[PDB]
Design an enzyme around this catalytic site. Structure first.
Site, mmCIF file in Angstrom:
data_model
loop_
_atom_site.group_PDB
_atom_site.id
_atom_site.type_symbol
_atom_site.label_atom_id
_atom_site.label_comp_id
_atom_site.label_asym_id
_atom_site.label_seq_id
_atom_site.Cartn_x
_atom_site.Cartn_y
_atom_site.Cartn_z
ATOM 1 C CD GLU A 192 -1.548 -2.449 1.729
ATOM 2 O OE1 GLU A 192 -2.374 -3.378 1.845
ATOM 3 O OE2 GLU A 192 -0.360 -2.564 2.110
ATOM 4 C CB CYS A 220 -1.685 -3.341 8.114
ATOM 5 S SG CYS A 220 -0.546 -1.941 7.931
HETATM 6 ZN ZN LIG Z 1 0.271 -2.027 5.862
#
Ligand SMILES: [Zn+2]
Length: 188
Positions: free
Chosen positions: A66, A95
């Site tokens: 990400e 996350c």
């Molecule tokens: Zn992450």
């Protein structure tokens, strides 16, 4: 960056919920520009990436997919007078720390509408739920990958060599279950 091999796609995007050795995250992205009430694909601004594992000559502690993705956006040199839809198809959802960083990015970049389609929800040791709500609140459209999105990603991002998308067992069922979970998460 352009094309993924079939075993990599199938292993990583299979949407049965269990980790089963899927420790990496793969993220496919494409960009569209708004033109006369229609979205127009920008062919040179599509690709895929994965998280970077810790390496002495890379990122000492690694870098999540990400963050690698957010790193590429400024390099696209998007026209700030235009409107874009940036769509990510991810094998795991972000996350918590990544969700926060993505929320920050999108808040600073309102020429971009971020749309996330995820194969699985990554629990992140119980931290994922707030993260997803935070990302949604900042304006991301979060959805679960269904057959049509898996097929799209196969057709677009995989070096299939003409082989058609072959759904794994339980694809529809896992997608339906996960869609229920996401509804519950986003409605708090
Ligand atoms: Zn992450």
């Amino acid at each position: 960056r352009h094309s993924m091999d079939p075993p990599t796609f199938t292993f990583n995007f299979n949407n049965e919920p269990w980790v089963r050795g899927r420790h990496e995250t793969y993220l496919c992205y494409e960009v569209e520009r708004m033109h006369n009430d229609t979205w127009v694909l920008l062919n040179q601004r599509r690709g895929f990436l994965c998280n970077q594992a810790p390496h002495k000559h890379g990122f000492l502690e690694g870098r999540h997919a990400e963050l690698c993705f957010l790193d590429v956006i400024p390099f696209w040199k998007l026209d700030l007078d235009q409107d874009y839809r940036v769509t990510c198809f991810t094998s795991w959802s972000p996350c918590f720390s990544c969700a926060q960083e993505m929320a920050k990015f999108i808040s600073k970049n309102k020429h971009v509408s971020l749309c996330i389609f995820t194969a699985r929800i990554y629990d992140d040791q119980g931290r994922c739920q707030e993260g997803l709500r935070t990302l949604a609140e900042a304006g991301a459209k979060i959805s679960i990958m269904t057959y049509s999105e898996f097929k799209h990603c196969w057709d677009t991002f995989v070096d299939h060599q003409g082989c058609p998308f072959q759904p794994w067992d339980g694809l529809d069922e896992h997608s339906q279950d996960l869609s229920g979970r996401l509804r519950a998460i986003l409605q708090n």
